[PDB]
Amino acid sequence: QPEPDMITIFIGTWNMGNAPPPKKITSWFLSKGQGKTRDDSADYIPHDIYVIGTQEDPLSEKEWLEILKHSLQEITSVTFKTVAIHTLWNIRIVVLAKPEHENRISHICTDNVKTGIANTLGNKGAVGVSFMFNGTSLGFVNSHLTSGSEKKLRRNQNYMNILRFLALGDKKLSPFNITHRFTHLFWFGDLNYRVDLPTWEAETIIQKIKQQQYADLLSHDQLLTERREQKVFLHFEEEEITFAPTYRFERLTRDKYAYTKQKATGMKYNLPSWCDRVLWKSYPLVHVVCQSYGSTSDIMTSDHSPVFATFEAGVTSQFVSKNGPGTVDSQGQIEFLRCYATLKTKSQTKFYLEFHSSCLESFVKSQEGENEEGSEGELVVKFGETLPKLKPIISDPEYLLDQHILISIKSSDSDESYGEGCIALRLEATETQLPIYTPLTHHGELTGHFQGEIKLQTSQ
Ligand SMILES: O=S1(=O)CCN(Cc2ccco2)CC1
Numbered sequence: 001q002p003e004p005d006m007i008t009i010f011i012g013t014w015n016m017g018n019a020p021p022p023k024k025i026t027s028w029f030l031s032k033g034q035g036k037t038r039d040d041s042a043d044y045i046p047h048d049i050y051v052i053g054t055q056e057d058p059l060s061e062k063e064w065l066e067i068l069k070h071s072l073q074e075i076t077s078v079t080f081k082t083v084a085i086h087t088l089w090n091i092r093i094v095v096l097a098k099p100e101h102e103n104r105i106s107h108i109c110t111d112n113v114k115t116g117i118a119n120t121l122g123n124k125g126a127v128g129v130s131f132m133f134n135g136t137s138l139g140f141v142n143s144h145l146t147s148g149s150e151k152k153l154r155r156n157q158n159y160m161n162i163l164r165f166l167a168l169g170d171k172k173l174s175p176f177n178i179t180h181r182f183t184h185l186f187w188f189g190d191l192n193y194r195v196d197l198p199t200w201e202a203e204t205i206i207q208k209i210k211q212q213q214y215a216d217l218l219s220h221d222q223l224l225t226e227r228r229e230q231k232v233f234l235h236f237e238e239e240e241i242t243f244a245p246t247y248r249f250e251r252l253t254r255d256k257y258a259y260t261k262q263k264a265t266g267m268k269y270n271l272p273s274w275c276d277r278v279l280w281k282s283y284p285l286v287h288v289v290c291q292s293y294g295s296t297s298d299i300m301t302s303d304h305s306p307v308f309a310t311f312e313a314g315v316t317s318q319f320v321s322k323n324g325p326g327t328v329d330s331q332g333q334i335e336f337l338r339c340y341a342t343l344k345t346k347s348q349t350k351f352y353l354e355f356h357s358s359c360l361e362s363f364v365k366s367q368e369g370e371n372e373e374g375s376e377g378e379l380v381v382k383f384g385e386t387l388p389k390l391k392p393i394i395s396d397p398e399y400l401l402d403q404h405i406l407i408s409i410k411s412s413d414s415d416e417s418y419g420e421g422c423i424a425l426r427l428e429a430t431e432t433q434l435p436i437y438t439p440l441t442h443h444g445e446l447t448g449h450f451q452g453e454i455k456l457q458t459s460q
Pocket residue numbers: 224225227228229235236
């Protein structure tokens with residue numbers, strides 16, 4: 001039985017509004033309703049992995065797992081295996097996989113982050129799961145961010161706390177947060193960003209939704225505008241939204257948006273909004289294609305509609321050679337030429353690099369770089385031809401061209417990372433000097449850039 005080089009992944013997010021689900025939820029897992037929907041001819045074809053995020057989930061883990069498994073079994077005639085389940089308060093993540101994948105999945109991790117302080121600590125935060133699928137690392141985050149149209153900056157702070165503090169993936173990748181630890185990272189949930197239009201415009205917004213005219217609403221969606229201004233979710237992707245706002249509905253129908261202020265809402269308006277979202281970030285030049293992104297129309301127990309997204313995702317095999325794992329493959333090498341980091345910092349410490357990759361036996365520390373002043377005020381750290389030659393464990397180009405090098409630039413004085421990025425080895429040529437580039441981030445915000453040239457030697 002050959003190992004796959006692609007899988008499909010289902011991502012669901014549903015804020016259940018503290019109510020039990022209806023008896024049939026299959027439309028969610030079939031990607032049927034409004035938006036980018038899945039073709040009927042695929043209904044019996046199981047996804048490889050199903051990741052279900054709920055918020056305001058009133059069920060026990062047992063109760064929800066039985067509903068999920070019975071749902072998938074009815075659709076596909078396959079009995080899915082539970083990879084992981086993790087709950088923080090009423091925020092939950094379930095990962096299910098086809099039974100044939102059970103011995104392809106390992107290194108399963110779960111964690112949660114509680115956001116806020118005092119008043120604002122006790123119901124918002126995130127849960128996550130990570131694991132390896134053969135040679136590919138996968139991370140999943142379900143977050144319930146702060147509510148309210150006038151709290152976008154709190155949501156952005158919630159995001160940074162979650163990516164800083166959620167402890168998933170390989171703990172040896174110590175300079176890197178979750179935005180660099182995975183081949184593919186999916187971040188979804190009730191992100192709670194709203195359509196920022198005046199309250200007086202509520203009925204006009206409803207009119208537009210009835211006409212399926214979303215453009216003047218999406219141009220005011222806080223998540224898209226905050227992303228465009230680089231305030232949140234830097235270097236993440238989202239499919240185009242072509243489904244109606246998923247919040248706030250009257251329960252038991254989808255015919256009415258319930259937007260007006262009530263004692264139950266703290267006297268806040270809830271204008272129709274795309275609260276419920278799926279975003280992703282994959283390493284450079286790895287295959288990832290969104291094949292559905294939409295909302296169900298027939299699940300009406302909550303004031304939110306469920307959201308689905310599905311993806312093709314490239315995966316690699318657990319490579320063994322005569323040499324690595326457990327030795328190098330002298331036929332292989334990675335050289336950096338003429339590299340420099342440009343940093344936004346005001347500090348004047350010396351800096352060194354760390355190179356991390358599962359194609360190395362362990363991470364590699366560089367010598368300190370040479371600091372110069374840039375023309376427009378910046379710090380330029382030059383490494384010259386001084387960088388250590390990296391010795392991959394396997395030299396086969398079918399393995400090495402699919403790998404990635406994570407880079408951290410660290411202060412000599414504090415050993416703290418001032419920026420993290422990632423370089424793909426999926427090059428146009430081997431034995432050839434080629435330009436490389438990554439932006440550098442720290443705590444998910446832009447801190448600089450790293451650019452230079454690479455020269456990769458494989459056994460071919
Ligand atoms: O780096 S990008 O692929 C990120 C997405 N966009 C920009 C964008 C549009 C809306 C919000 O942000 C193109 C460049």
